[PDB]
Symmetry: C2
Subunit: 176 residues, 2 copies
């Protein structure tokens, strides 16, 4: 019985819902590459709708996000929505909001997408956990409580975030 612990950014500050963070990797160079909003393949969607991370961190920085906790603050092991915190055209507002996709028969998993909703019964909820001595992991939780770890599959040469069983993605939160 430990009690709720705050998530901390790379500066050691508690995550604030009114701030923006890049989700960066544990690794540097070739193992680096921040999370970003990109275009998927075989995607009907009118807007960018894939959640990816870069193939190395020697290039662009990630797309910032905010965390919308269901009730109150950003704490470990607590449900929240995640949304890329940038301006889009009216059409694409939905497509900043993280969502888990339909089970993809080739990968035999669900890939992370955008196009969901904030704070509803149909929304995709995630939690931030410390499964490790350094950094955090993201889990997807429907409706401990039957969650799934987020990691990466390789899709058209890109790092596509997806649900996995082993090697989840280790991340830190870098205030923007």
């Amino acid at each position: 019985s430990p009690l709720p612990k705050p998530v901390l950014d790379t500066n050691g500050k508690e995550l604030n819902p009114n701030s923006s963070y890049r989700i960066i990797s544990i690794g540097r160079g070739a193992l680096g590459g921040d999370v970003y909003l990109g275009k998927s393949p075989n995607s009907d969607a009118p807007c960018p709708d894939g959640v990816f991370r870069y193939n190395s961190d020697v290039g662009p920085s990630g797309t910032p996000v905010r965390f919308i906790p269901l009730s109150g603050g950003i704490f470990e092991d607590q449900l929240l929505n995640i949304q890329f915190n940038i301006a889009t055209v009216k059409l694409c507002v939905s497509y900043t909001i993280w969502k888990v996709g339909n089970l993809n028969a080739y990968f035999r998993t669900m890939l992370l997408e955008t196009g969901g909703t904030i704070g509803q019964a149909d929304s995709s909820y995630f939690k931030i956990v410390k499964l490790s001595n350094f950094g955090y992991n993201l889990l997807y939780c429907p409706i401990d409580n039957f969650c799934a770890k987020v990691g990466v599959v390789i899709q058209n040469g890109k790092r596509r975030l997806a649900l996995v069983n082993e090697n989840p993605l280790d991340v830190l939160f870098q205030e923007v």
Copy 2:
């Protein structure tokens, strides 16, 4: 346009339409204060609609913006729209986009607001220029006749963007003199 000059951020790097910048003050201390999206008192907008700067740089950092040229890249003396680069609800998307308000007969000028459009005939276009030899200034540049604008004189009827004190807050606004001197810090 004696060869076209890209606008540079605080690292000397050319500004890009797909990055975000904070608009920061140039002076530090009490002269400091980044641009932010704030709630206007005396506005019935359904979302915050005021372009302000903080009263010193000890407070929060500014609301990031992106620059959206009418055409092409980001260059000095070239028309662009400006938008605070943040997620909002659908009804509030407009209120990330910079525009010039109507004549405020009390301040005897127009206040900078959000509520605008991007890349249309009705959009509020601005330019990034170099008046003083350190940092940049913003101008508002009417693309139709500014019947209503007191300070739309300069050259092409462009007006200097500066600051007025509204409920003890620095509110951006068209000024006759003392333009706001700004640097762009990549987010």
